[PDB]
C-alpha cells in the first residue's frame, strides 16, 4: 500500500519528465519545420517565374543560384542537431548523420524510420520526433498520382503539358504511357496514347485515321485521368506518363536547379521547360503539403501532452490524498 | 603489365559474379511485388463491391474476413527472405524483421533506408535492393494530395464526397479545411469552408447569406481542389479535408475491414460508408501504382545488367588479345 504509492509516485516522477522533455524536443521540432516551409514557400515563388517567360537567361541562371543556396538550407535543416549532438531526423540511429549525397550522385538517407514512444501518463504512449524517411524523401513525384517527363527523342514542336490529374478514380489504370503527336492521312496533327501493359488506349485500334485531332489547350482523357497540351508541337514529339515514384525534396530543388540553367532564348527552347516547370510546381507542393502534414500531426501530439499534464496532477492529488487519508488510520 | 592485367581479370570475375547475383536477386524480387500485386488487385475488386448498396451485411463481413486474409498475405510479402535466410526490404538492417506491429496497434519499419549498389563493370554501380520504407510504408493517403474523414460530429444526414483532386497546381494551398452544411436566412441548405490557416474561403465573408448553396452531385472548389457531394446532408453535418499523410498500405487494409464491419443496413449508415470507400480506392490504387514504379524502376537495373553482361564480355575478349599480342613479344 504505502511502498506502492511511493512507487506510484516514483512513475509520476518520470512520467512528467518524460511529458516535459517531449514538449521540448517537438517545440525544437516545430521550429525546424516551420524554417523548412519558409525555404519552400520561396522555392515556389522562385519556380513560379521560372515559367514566366519575360525573364532574362541571366535572371534565370541567377536563381539557379538561389535555389543553390535553398537545397544546401534544406540539407541543413534535414541533419540538424538537437539539444543532445544527436540528429532529430534520423530515427533510432541517434549519431548517424540522416541526409548525405553519395557519389552515385542522388541524396540518400541513412537513418531509419524507428519512432521513441513515452510513457508520458500510465497508459499513453507520444512519438517525441519523426525520421528524415518520412519527413524529407519519400514524397510522390508528378501530381502525386503520374509524372510527366520527356522522352529519349528531343521534341522539334513548343508543345507543352499540364500536371493534370486522376479525375475518374474508378476508371485509373496505373501505367506506362506514351503520348505521340502524329498524322492523320488527311494532313491534320492527330494525338495518340498507347502503354506497356494496356496496348493501345487513344484510340484502341492505333490507327492514326480512327483518332482524335489535337485541339491547343484541349483536355486529353484517358484511363481515368485529364491534362491539357499547349503549343504547337510537330509529328513525331513524345511525352512519357507514368506513375508517380518516390522522391526527395532534395533532387526536387536539384532538379529545378537543372531547368534553370537550361537554354531559354528561342520559343522551341521554351516549351521544353514548361512541362517540367508544371511537374516542378506540383512537387514542391505535395512537399508543402507533406510537411504540413507531419505538422499537424506534431500539433495533435502536443494537444496529447498538455493532456497530460493536468491528468497527471489529477492523479497526483489523488495520491497525495490516499496519503493524508491513510497516514490519518495511524 | 601483365600484372595488371592478371588483376583486371581478377576485377572482371568479381564484376560477372556481382552482376550474375543482382540479375537474380532482382528477379527473385520482381516476384514478390509481382505476388502483391496480385493482392492488391484482388483488395480494389473487394473495395469497389463495398461501395456497392446491394450486398448484404452478411455479404460484406465475409469480405472482412478475405481483406484480413490479404493483409496477412502482404506482411508475409514484406517480411520475405531471400536466398541467404536475410530480409529482402530491410535494408542494410539484413536480421531484422522489416515489419511488425506494436501494441500501439499501428503497424510500423524496423529496417532502414539503404541499398547495397554493386560493381558489375569498371563504372556502373547498379541498386540490389529496394526497402520497406519505400515499397510498403511510405504512400500517401486520400487522393495522394488531400483526403476526406469525417470530424467528431457524426453526420446527421445522407451526405457523401468524391475523392476529389487538385485541378489547379498553382491556386493550390495545403490547409485543414472544415466543410461545413447550414442554412439560409432563407431556409435553403448551403455549403462552407474554412480552414485553420486560410480562414474563410467559401464564401470570404463567413456570413451563410453571402455563401453558395448545395447543388446534388455539384462540383464544389476551393483553392485549386475540386470535389463533388452527393445525398442529402442536414444542417451542422461536417467533413474535413486535410493535406495527404503518408500511411502504409497495411493501414489502408486495416481500414477497408473496420469499414466493410460498420453497420450498412439503413440509408443514413450506407452514407458514412461511402465517403471513406471512395477514399479506400484512392489509396489502393495510389499503391497499385506506386508498385509499378518499383517494378518499373526494377525493370531498368535489370536493363543495365544486360547491358553489363555484353560489356564485360567485351573488356574480357580484349584482355584475352592484350595477352596474345603481348606473349607474342616473347
Given at each position: 500500500?504505502?511502498?506502492?504509492i511511493?512507487?506510484?509516485?516514483?512513475?509520476?516522477?518520470?512520467?512528467?519528465?518524460?511529458?516535459?522533455?517531449?514538449?521540448?524536443?517537438?517545440?525544437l521540432?516545430?521550429?525546424?519545420?516551420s524554417?523548412?516551409?519558409n525555404?519552400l514557400?520561396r522555392?515556389?515563388?522562385?519556380?513560379?517565374?521560372?515559367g514566366?517567360?519575360?525573364?532574362?537567361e541571366?535572371?534565370?541562371?541567377?536563381?539557379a543560384?538561389?535555389?543553390q543556396?535553398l537545397?544546401?538550407?534544406?540539407?541543413?535543416?534535414?541533419?540538424t542537431?538537437?539539444?543532445?549532438?544527436s540528429?532529430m531526423?534520423?530515427?533510432?540511429?541517434?549519431?548517424?548523420?540522416p541526409?548525405?549525397?553519395?557519389?552515385s550522385?542522388?541524396y540518400?538517407?541513412?537513418?531509419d524510420s524507428?519512432?521513441r514512444?513515452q510513457?508520458?501518463?500510465?497508459?499513453?504512449?507520444?512519438?517525441?520526433?519523426?525520421?528524415?524517411?518520412?519527413?524529407?524523401?519519400?514524397?510522390?513525384?508528378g501530381?502525386?498520382?503520374?509524372?510527366?517527363r520527356?522522352?529519349?527523342?528531343?521534341?522539334?514542336?513548343?508543345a507543352?503539358v499540364?500536371?493534370?490529374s486522376?479525375?475518374?478514380?474508378?476508371?485509373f489504370?496505373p501505367?506506362?504511357?506514351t503520348?505521340?503527336?502524329?498524322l492523320?492521312?488527311?494532313?491534320?496533327?492527330?494525338v495518340?496514347?498507347?502503354?506497356?501493359?494496356?496496348?493501345?488506349?487513344?484510340?484502341?485500334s492505333?490507327?492514326?485515321?480512327?483518332?482524335?485531332?489535337?485541339q491547343?489547350?484541349?483536355?486529353?482523357?484517358?484511363?481515368?485521368?485529364?491534362?491539357?497540351?499547349?503549343?504547337?508541337?510537330?509529328?513525331?514529339?513524345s511525352?512519357?506518363?507514368?506513375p508517380?515514384?518516390?522522391?526527395?525534396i532534395?533532387?526536387?530543388?536539384?532538379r529545378?536547379?537543372?531547368?534553370?540553367?537550361?537554354?531559354?532564348?528561342?520559343?522551341?527552347?521554351?516549351?521544353?521547360?514548361?512541362?517540367?516547370?508544371?511537374?516542378?510546381l506540383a512537387?514542391i507542393?505535395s512537399?508543402?503539403?507533406?510537411?504540413?502534414?507531419?505538422?499537424?500531426?506534431?500539433?495533435?501530439?502536443l494537444?496529447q501532452?498538455?493532456?497530460?499534464?493536468?491528468?497527471?496532477?489529477?492523479?497526483?492529488?489523488?495520491?497525495?490524498?490516499?496519503?493524508?487519508?491513510?497516514?490519518?488510520?495511524?
Open positions: 500500500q504505502i511502498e506502492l511511493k512507487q506510484r509516485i516514483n512513475n509520476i516522477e518520470l512520467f512528467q519528465n518524460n511529458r516535459q522533455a517531449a514538449d521540448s524536443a517537438l517545440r521540432e516545430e521550429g525546424i519545420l524554417n523548412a516551409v525555404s514557400h522555392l515556389r515563388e522562385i519556380q513560379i517565374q521560372a514566366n517567360p519575360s525573364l532574362s541571366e535572371d534565370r541562371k541567377t536563381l543560384v538561389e535555389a543556396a537545397l544546401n538550407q534544406l540539407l541543413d535543416y534535414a541533419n542537431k538537437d539539444s543532445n549532438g540528429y531526423f534520423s530515427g533510432s540511429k541517434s549519431l548517424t548523420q541526409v548525405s549525397l553519395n557519389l550522385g542522388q540518400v538517407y541513412n537513418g524507428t519512432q514512444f510513457a508520458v501518463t500510465t497508459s499513453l504512449l507520444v512519438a517525441v520526433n519523426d525520421t528524415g524517411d518520412n519527413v524529407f524523401m519519400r514524397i510522390p513525384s501530381n502525386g498520382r503520374f509524372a510527366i520527356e522522352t529519349l527523342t528531343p521534341n522539334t514542336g513548343t507543352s499540364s500536371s493534370g486522376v479525375t475518374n478514380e474508378a476508371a489504370v501505367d506506362n504511357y503520348m505521340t503527336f502524329a492523320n492521312s488527311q494532313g491534320n496533327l492527330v495518340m496514347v498507347s502503354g506497356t501493359l494496356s496496348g493501345n488506349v487513344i484510340p484502341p492505333g490507327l492514326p485515321d480512327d483518332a482524335p485531332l489535337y491547343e489547350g484541349s483536355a486529353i482523357g484517358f484511363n481515368g485521368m485529364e491534362m491539357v497540351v499547349s503549343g504547337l508541337p510537330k509529328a513525331g514529339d511525352f512519357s506518363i507514368s508517380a515514384k518516390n522522391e526527395s532534395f533532387s526536387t530543388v536539384q529545378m536547379i537543372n531547368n534553370l540553367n537550361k537554354p531559354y532564348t528561342s520559343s522551341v527552347e521554351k516549351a521544353a521547360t514548361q512541362t517540367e516547370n508544371n511537374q516542378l512537387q507542393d512537399a508543402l503539403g507533406h510537411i504540413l502534414s507531419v505538422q499537424s500531426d506534431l500539433g495533435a501530439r494537444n501532452l498538455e493532456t497530460a499534464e493536468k491528468a497527471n496532477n489529477d492523479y497526483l492529488d489523488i495520491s497525495a490524498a490516499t496519503l493524508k487519508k491513510l497516514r490519518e488510520i495511524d
